[PDB]
Design a protein around this ligand. Structure first.
Ligand SMILES: Nc1nc2c(ncn2[C@@H]2O[C@H](COP(=O)(O)CP(=O)(O)OP(=O)(O)O)[C@@H](O)[C@H]2O)c(=O)[nH]1
Ligand SMILES: Nc1nc2c(ncn2[C@@H]2O[C@H](COP(=O)(O)OP(=O)(O)OP(=O)(O)O)[C@@H](O)[C@H]2O)c(=O)[nH]1
Ligand SMILES: Nc1nc2c(ncn2[C@@H]2O[C@H](COP(=O)(O)OP(=O)(O)OP(=O)(O)O)[C@@H](O)[C@H]2O)c(=O)[nH]1
Ligand SMILES: Nc1ncnc2c1ncn2[C@@H]1O[C@H](COP(=O)(O)OP(=O)(O)OP(=O)(O)O)[C@@H](O)[C@H]1O
Lengths: 427, 426, 325, 427
């Protein structure tokens, strides 16, 4: 089992330097680059007593790449993998996909192919990006179209950071997401969304950290994407590979946007006073405010969800938990898929970063749950987009790049084509 | 990587630009001679974006100083960091403009543009890939207003896709240090509105008002005013000079702040601003700066923002801080004061942070805002232009230089159109 | 005083690249004023079919426009459509052929023919000009040395070009030699979707200054024949290199006037003509003392069915606008 | 718990420099401005190791402001908070409210709002002023009308110094009080009155100080207003917040004028000879001559009163004291609210100023008591006002400012509207 990762934009590298921070600590890999089969799916054997990571950090702006090259994890990452551009995308889907993308995609695609050639058990891919930015929206849309025609059959995990309802870092980020989603709909197998403000109240309420940064955020997101692939690394009573998440979450080929939520998230002093068990975590993840995406689940119905655990967790009490959750009438599962449960157990417990705010726990759980609760987000993104689209604001840059109102009109009606079938299956 | 060429047109351009190299050289740790003695290794990476490396660990800036009188070049050469500039960039004529836009744009300036255009060919070739031009001039007078806006058109003909950023200080009704301010201003904005993609409108009244309320300076000279405006020019170009959690290029602000090609006149501002007698009695936290950020008397323009509505604003913070409380603060200013923001945009605020603050300070920020309050400045100068133009007063000198009254009427057609453009989206 | 802007539609047969693919024939004609596309009518003044000839379109579209510009008022003509829509084939076409020509030579031929019918005392002064946009600069075709020109305003604040060449003609054969020099010197590219791809706006202005010596009454009428380019989709067209630079300029022009035509439709207070220089020369067409005629050329193929939908809503939105004539 | 104070006029700054003299001594704050949660309601944390007071000293005459700026507490107070005017009100309600007030209220109101923005637990306000002056009557009436329309819901403690029956500093002070009370009636939630001559016999009899100044007076008044807010600063067995005094003292919305009295007030040499206990202090405060307002309580009936104590005072003996006071027939509680008792205890004892005439005591008590004993004062103020109003004396200045006889006539009948309901509830 092997899988190749790729990080794009400012959002990717902060996830890159954070998510790879715990993988090298999980496998006992020192930061220098050296210390049997668990690390094979993310680290290769570099001759004798040395490793190299299976990732490519592409970015148009080199302001992050030189920081990593002058950082503490210099000897770990290969110097060729740290790809650099020439100039930033400027929050432009057009500039990051057409002008700046074409003159560098020929180098990135050849670099991905030569690394994929020596693979034998390449299960799929996982992409880290963000549609709200320029590089994460423009350049990621280019490679996803160009590699899908080449490989196609292999799976893909799009870990995209979405905009919040009221919180927003930029003003043109609806224009970046509305265009790229028109291309991401037909080629992306499954995209797990993340919201920026959804992390803010989590650490404020549960972790009681009142001045964290992205380094606290990405350490949590890096732990979330480590648990979903933890079955392939270490042994488990009920293992699940990368292809398992393609079938039990994507009932229709276009409805491929599951939510995500993770628990337990408890501080150091609070962990000892609270009892860690299977019951409360199985109830905590289904709590609506305990999600990584601020969307009301009660406004829709759940299609299917997977209960992947960690640590020494027996398989019986987890079955009693989901059985009790089925009896709770506060939630409501859809009649089209009532038995949408997928239990999973792993022996290797959650890790802990030295100095990190997250506390050590003997058991954990991660969740990917498909539901119709996301249609209100796309409805909200369409309504706010119509306010700017009517005045034709922030359009002269895109057509100044080469675009026009036609694809903008095709992107608007595509969400309208997505609104109808989310409401149809929600019945 | 993403180099910038500094141009300094007019008497104000040479002085405002001399302080720009003053303040950024301190945080970079550059000697007055030209060597490097900085304390952190992070300062050495992106030195190429404004300076050129030389032998003996020496560095020289890419400052294109241009003027028509030799007095400003001699004073800047004898400055604190006057010796660091290269002498060949100090191109200058003999006779001044005398506050005449026609002389420095058609007859007197055309003798000098051929000498400076070949200089930028050398500097544009020495860099790896130019990002944008950071020009500095003043609408008042003839040299910076006439010759400064001339090379804007010539460079745009060569580079029809690069960025052309300008920090233009405009006249004002109460502060009028020159009689030919409306005529020089009316002809300059005809070209700046069409050619340049970015413009930072600075007013001298706000620079006097900002130093009264909070700095409490009893004898502020021109050097004190230059420190305020120079910090804003440094704050905007800081993300591509030091690393940060979210680096915003100069063009990334252009895509976010310029919804239409002519609508690019920005409102500059700066924080923190506190006197030496009250620096100890103030909190440097993010809630304290954010309230002072969007204060009605904080920006560098005399126009009241309460008389208009912000179409888009930016706050590029600078220094180690938690971005969680930042986003709640930008959420509150747009929600609590939603009447002073356009309803046809969901979010009017841009965000950006940096890790290494300036020397002496811990956290800071810089404001850039495109609002409808600026139309009160463009119309009052138009009334000054219309009052004198209707009798053809002080136009016979322009006609001597080959000009015509039709171009003055055409400039008025551009003036009355752009103020109505702000009236549409208000 | 108030003349409604006419927006006439036209289709063509499928090109050689379309019939080889096998695109479906979507164009369904219902009457003459309206046309159905996927069960959606679009009311226009005149819908020209694919089998229409060049002369059949001319005598119905720009026949009465010759009377308007000669009476004393002004005329303004310009087409619109996506790539491979048949705009240049409608406007210029084949000049030397007896029937393959378009609108420009048929107009100027009728101007000289009409002048022969009237009395000799009506003295005319026909001056021609021709310039194309290239890298956001007004490139003059009659003079290759000039790469950029400046645009000014006249006495009543109507924009018009200054410094451009104005060759005073006296016979219609001279105009045929002039347009051949302009068409031959026109920078044309080659792409997968279109061979004779007109990737720039070509303006053909004719200032018709006439005077009657008996009554001593002076009259003038402008005549803009501006051929626009097509909105090239790079995914379908495969633009790269210098063709992308052509795409940046033409897409700004059609989108700039798209903001203007949408502003007049909804009834804006400002009407931002200042968005681009292409709108300045067309400011007299959309809000001046001239009759506007918008020829909506569109392709009946299903390969660009979404682009044709954008072009029809673009046309009907312009029908509601009225000039201040 | 936070509360913002404001001092107006000559009366306010003498209360300001005195009342803030003991607060910084209570929290161990040196006069320079530097030394965990008790000081938060009156002192903020200015970065690291520095404080700043939550007060605004507004005054038209800068003769007091430059003294404080050149005084000993220079490094403590913010220089921006020391607001200065241009010219004094001249004991004119009209000049301090309309002409001089409007050109400076725009700066003062914006200063109050920006300081209130960073607050989170702002309970209310407390105003220090005096209706017998010009700035304290005119400018205070302006801000109270202008902030009440803005905030409204928040509480307000008006600590106003009233004129005496026979003692008086000026001649126009009835005209200053009669006008401002018309505006203060409907917007002020509760106003605790203080009399100038009532302090004269207190220190003469009990403290036996035969030549004190205002510095001795305001040190006592500053101690009185420190005890009412002492429950919020330090912990207590029975705490009371700022909203407690608004309900249990103001039964009707217009009858919002409680009396005040304080005990024990014993000198240094007299403290060691006198036995400090709960019995005598609980009887001493109800003694009529021991009040801060010279008004006969026996001429009316008491509505309700609060017994807030200080220091190590057990809760049982205070209950026995109020029980014995209920049996004393020398007083008479009204039948409309017989159970008008509100006990309160605080652990932090009373402080002592170095060199002050007040002595250290292990227990103290402060009293606010609503009663009908104030109606004789308003009747007296109306009778003396009728002598000047009949002759139209001291009227040409007010109409010279812009006023007229209408508001003067409306101000006269307003007290007549206040005279009737005090007599009605007194039944
Ligand atoms: N913000 C600043 N404004 C300045 C400064 N110096 C001048 N000015 C303002 O710009 C106005 C005109 O600009 P200049 O001083 O450069 C006049 P110029 O040198 O272009 O012509 P001559 O000196 O007559 O050759 C001037 O009246 C001031 O209002 C300065 O250092 N900083
Ligand atoms: N949650 C989270 N989001 C991030 C992080 N870094 C970047 N982002 C996202 O990035 C968006 C801002 O645009 P960027 O992705 O930074 O764009 P860029 O890479 O700087 O390049 P330009 O778009 O051209 O300016 C925000 O909306 C964020 O959601 C991060 O560390 N954590
Ligand atoms: N009890 C007491 N009253 C004071 C004190 N200081 C001022 N006053 C009151 O102030 C009143 C006199 O008017 P001022 O407040 O001094 O008025 P001003 O601030 O001087 O301004 P003008 O009224 O315009 O003269 C007197 O009636 C006093 O009751 C003080 O320290 N203690
Ligand atoms: N009415 C028509 N009948 C038959 N063929 C036509 C017709 N119109 C166009 N064509 C064909 O189209 C080709 C020329 O393409 P043309 O120059 O018209 O592209 P275009 O649509 O004008 O491009 P643009 O939209 O950019 O102006 C010719 O080979 C011609 O055969």
């Amino acid at each position: 089992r092997e899988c190749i990762s790729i990080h794009v934009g400012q959002a990717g590298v902060q996830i890159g330097n954070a998510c790879w921070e715990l993988y090298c600590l999980e496998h006992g890999i020192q930061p220098d680059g050296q210390m049997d089969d668990s690390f094979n799916t993310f680290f290769s054997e570099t001759g004798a007593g040395k490793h190299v990571p299976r990732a490519v950090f592409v970015d148009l702006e080199p302001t992050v790449i030189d920081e990593v090259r002058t950082g503490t994890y210099r000897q770990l990452f290969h110097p060729e993998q740290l790809i650099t551009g020439k100039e930033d995308a400027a929050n432009n889907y057009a500039r990051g996909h057409y002008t700046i993308g074409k003159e560098i995609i020929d180098l990135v695609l050849d670099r991905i192919r030569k690394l994929a050639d020596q693979c034998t058990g390449l299960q799929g891919f996982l992409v880290f990006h963000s549609f709200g930015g320029g590089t994460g929206s423009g350049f990621t849309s280019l490679l996803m179209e160009r590699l899908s025609v080449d490989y196609g059959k292999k799976s893909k995990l799009e870990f995209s950071i979405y905009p919040a309802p009221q919180v927003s870092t930029a003003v043109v980020e609806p224009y970046n997401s509305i265009l790229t989603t028109h291309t991401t709909l037909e080629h992306s197998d499954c995209a797990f969304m993340v919201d920026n403000e959804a992390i803010y109240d989590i650490c404020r309420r549960n972790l009681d950290i009142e001045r964290p940064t992205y380094t606290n955020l990405n350490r949590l997101i890096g732990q979330i994407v480590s648990s979903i692939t933890a079955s392939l690394r270490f042994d488990g009573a009920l293992n699940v590979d990368l292809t398992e998440f393609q079938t039990n979450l994507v009932p229709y080929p276009r409805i491929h946007f599951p939510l995500a939520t993770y628990a337990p998230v408890i501080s150091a002093e609070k962990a000892y006073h609270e009892q860690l068990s299977v019951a409360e975590i199985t109830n905590a993840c289904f709590e609506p405010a305990n999600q990584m995406v601020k969307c009301d689940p009660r406004h829709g119905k759940y299609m299917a969800c997977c209960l992947l655990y960690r640590g020494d967790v027996v398989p019986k009490d987890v079955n009693a938990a989901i059985a009790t959750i089925k009896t709770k009438r506060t939630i409501q599962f859809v009649d089209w898929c009532p038995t949408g449960f997928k239990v999973g157990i792993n022996y290797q417990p959650p890790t802990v970063v030295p100095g990190g705010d997250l506390a050590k726990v003997q058991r954990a759980v991660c969740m990917l749950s498909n539901t119709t609760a996301i249609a209100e987000a796309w409805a909200r993104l369409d309504h706010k987009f119509d306010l700017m689209y009517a005045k034709r604001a922030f359009v002269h840059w895109y057509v100044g790049e080469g675009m026009e109102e036609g694809e903008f009109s095709e992107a608007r009606e595509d969400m309208a084509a997505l609104e109808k079938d989310y409401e149809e299956v929600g019945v | 990587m993403r180099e910038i060429v500094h141009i300094q047109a007019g008497q104000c351009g040479n002085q405002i630009g001399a302080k720009f190299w003053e303040v950024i050289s301190d945080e970079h740790g550059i000697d007055p001679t030209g060597s490097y003695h900085g304390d952190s290794d992070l300062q050495l990476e992106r030195i190429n974006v404004y300076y050129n490396e030389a032998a003996g660990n020496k560095y020289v800036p890419r400052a294109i100083l241009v003027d028509l009188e030799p007095g400003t070049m001699d004073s800047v050469r004898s400055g604190p960091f006057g010796q660091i500039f290269r002498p060949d960039n100090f191109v200058f004529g003999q006779s001044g403009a005398g506050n005449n836009w026609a002389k420095g744009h058609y007859t007197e300036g055309a003798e000098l543009v051929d000498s400076v255009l070949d200089v930028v060919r050398k500097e544009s070739e020495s860099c790896d890939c130019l990002q944008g031009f950071q020009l500095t001039h003043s609408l008042g007078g003839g040299t910076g207003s006439g010759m400064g806006t001339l090379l804007i058109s010539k460079i745009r003909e060569e580079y029809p896709d690069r960025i052309m950023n300008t920090f233009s200080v405009m006249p004002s009704p109460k502060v009028s240090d020159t009689v030919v301010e409306p005529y020089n201003a009316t002809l300059s904005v005809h070209q700046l509105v069409e050619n340049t993609d970015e413009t930072y409108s600075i007013d001298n009244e706000a620079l006097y008002d900002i130093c009264f309320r909070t700095l409490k300076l009893t004898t502020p000279t021109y050097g004190d005013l230059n420190h305020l405006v120079s910090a804003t020019m440094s704050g905007v170009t800081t993300c591509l000079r030091f690393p940060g959690q979210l680096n915003a290029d100069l063009r990334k602000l252009a895509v976010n702040m310029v919804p239409f090609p002519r609508l690019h006149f920005f409102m500059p501002g700066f924080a923190p601003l506190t006197s030496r007698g009250s620096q100890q009695y103030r909190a440097l936290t993010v809630p304290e700066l954010t309230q002072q950020m969007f204060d009605s008397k904080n920006m560098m323009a005399a126009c009241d923002p309460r008389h208009g509505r912000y179409l888009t604003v930016a706050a590029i913070f600078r220094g180690r801080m938690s971005m969680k409380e930042v986003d709640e603060q930008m959420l509150n200013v747009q929600n609590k004061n939603s009447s002073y923001f356009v309803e046809w945009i969901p979010n009017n605020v841009k965000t950006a942070v940096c890790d290494i603050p300036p020397r002496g300070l811990k956290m800071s920020a810089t404001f850039i805002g495109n609002s409808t309050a600026i139309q009160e400045l463009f119309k009052r100068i138009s009334e000054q232009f219309t009052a004198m133009f209707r009798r053809k007063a002080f136009l016979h000198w322009y006609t001597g230089e080959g000009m015509d009254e039709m171009e003055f009427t055409e400039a008025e057609s551009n003036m009355n159109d752009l103020v109505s453009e702000y009236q549409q989206y208000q | 005083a108030e003349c409604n802007i006419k927006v006439m539609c036209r289709f063509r047969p499928l090109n050689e690249s379309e019939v080889n693919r096998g695109d479906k024939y979507i164009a369904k004609f219902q009457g003459e004023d309206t046309v159905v596309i996927a069960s959606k009518p679009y009311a226009f003044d005149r819908v020209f079919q694919s089998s229409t000839s060049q002369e059949q379109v001319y005598n119905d579209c720009a026949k009465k426009i010759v009377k308007d510009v000669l009476e004393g008022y002004n005329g303004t003509i310009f087409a619109y459509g996506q790539t491979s829509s048949g705009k240049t084939h409608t406007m210029e076409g084949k000049l030397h052929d007896p029937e393959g020509m378009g609108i420009i030579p048929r107009i100027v031929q009728d101007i000289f023919n009409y002048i022969y019918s009237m009395d000799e005392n009506l003295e005319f002064h026909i001056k021609v000009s021709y310039f194309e946009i290239y890298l956001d600069k007004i490139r003059d075709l009659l003079d290759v040395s000039k790469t950029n020109l400046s645009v000014h305003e006249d006495k009543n604040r109507v924009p018009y070009v200054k410094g451009c060449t104005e060759r005073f003609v006296c016979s219609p054969d001279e105009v045929m030699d002039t347009i051949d020099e302009g068409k031959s010197n026109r920078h044309v590219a080659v792409t997968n979707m279109n061979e004779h791809s007109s990737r720039s706006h070509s303006i053909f202005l004719i200032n018709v200054k006439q005077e009657n010596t008996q009554t001593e009454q002076k009259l003038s009428g402008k005549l803009y024949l501006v051929d626009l380019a097509g909105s090239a989709k790079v995914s379908k067209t495969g633009a790269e290199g210098a063709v992308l630079d052509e795409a940046k300029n033409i897409n700004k022009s059609l989108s700039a006037l798209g903001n203007v035509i949408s502003a007049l439709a909804e009834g804006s207070t400002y009407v931002p003509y200042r968005d681009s220089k292409m709108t300045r020369i067309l400011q007299d067409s959309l809000g001046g003392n001239c009759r506007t005629t918008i020829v909506i050329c569109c392709s009946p193929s299903s390969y660009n069915e979404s682009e044709t939908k954008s072009t029809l809503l673009f046309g009907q939105r312009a029908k509601t606008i009225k000039n201040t004539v």
